[PDB]
Structure 1
Amino acid sequence: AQRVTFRRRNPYNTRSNKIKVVKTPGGILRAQHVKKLATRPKCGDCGSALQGISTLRPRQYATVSKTHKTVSRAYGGSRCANCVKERIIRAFLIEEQKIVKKVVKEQTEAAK
């Protein structure tokens, strides 16, 4: 049973010193250093992992093209579709009730 070393100079089992044991074409086991796993991007409103978007570390989003980082709505890689729906509904309905408040106030104040 082949045993394995850290291939780097840090000897401590830290979060950034993670080690996968991997067989090689020379037939030996070797440590392979693992980068930290990536978190999914989240909606500003609901906090859920929003879909369509890629899970990368931050400076890789610069390497990657834009179809990986956005979907084709307003508020694409920022907000969930149901959150967007809520705020559209809310906008339209409140902007209607604003008109209604205006005319109600007019019809009340112009009574005298």
Structure 2
Amino acid sequence: AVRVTYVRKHSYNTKSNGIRIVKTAGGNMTVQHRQKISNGVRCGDCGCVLAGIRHIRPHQYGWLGKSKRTVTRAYGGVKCHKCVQKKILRAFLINEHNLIKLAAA
């Protein structure tokens, strides 16, 4: 069993000081600095995690392809497909009701 050491000058097991021990040539084990776990986007109404958008750090979406950070739909990337269907029905049905309620009832 090969025992390793911290490479950087951090000495405490904080969230940002996560390490992974991998093997290298000759039976030597080195230290890799592993990333933190992020959260994905959430629907602004129901707070459910959206599909089609990866769970990566906020600055990493700048490196993402322009089509890999949003879904091709009205309110894509901010609202679930169910969050949007009810939006359309609300917009249409209420406007229809306001046409028979007022405007020569």
Task: Look up the SS of the partner of 1:72 in the other structure.
Answer: coil
- The CA deviation string for residues 51-105 of structure 1, in whole angstroms up to 9 with x for no partner, is 01122100111111121111111011111000000110111111111112204xx
- Between the two proteins, the alignment pairs up a number of residues equal to 105
Which stretches in structure 1 are left out of the alignment for 5+ residues?
A: 108-112
Q: How far apart are 1:27 and its partner, in Å?
A: 2.3
2:34 aligns with: 34
CA distance in 2, matches of 1:65, 1:79: 20
1:89 aligns with: 89
2:8 aligns with: 8
4+ runs of 1 displaced by more than 4 Å?
A: none
CA distance in 2, matches of 1:10, 1:80: 41
Residues 91-110 of structure 1: pairs in structure 2 closer than 5 A: 91-103=91-103, 106-107=104-105
2:65 aligns with: 65
Q: How far apart are 1:24 and its partner, in Å?
A: 1.3
1:47 aligns with: 47
CA distance in 2, matches of 1:33, 1:40: 22
Task: Look up the SS of the partner of 1:68 in the other structure.
Answer: coil
Structure 2 length-normalised TM: 0.92
Structure 1 length-normalised TM: 0.87
CA distance in 1, matches of 2:6, 2:46: 41
Which stretches in structure 2 are left out of the alignment for 5+ residues?
A: none
Of structures 1 and 2, the larger Rg is shown by: 1
2:17 aligns with: 17
| Matched-pair identity in % | 48
CA distance in 2, matches of 1:77, 1:22: 36
- The CA deviation string for residues 6-42 of structure 1, in whole angstroms up to 9 with x for no partner, is 1110100000001111111342112211111221111
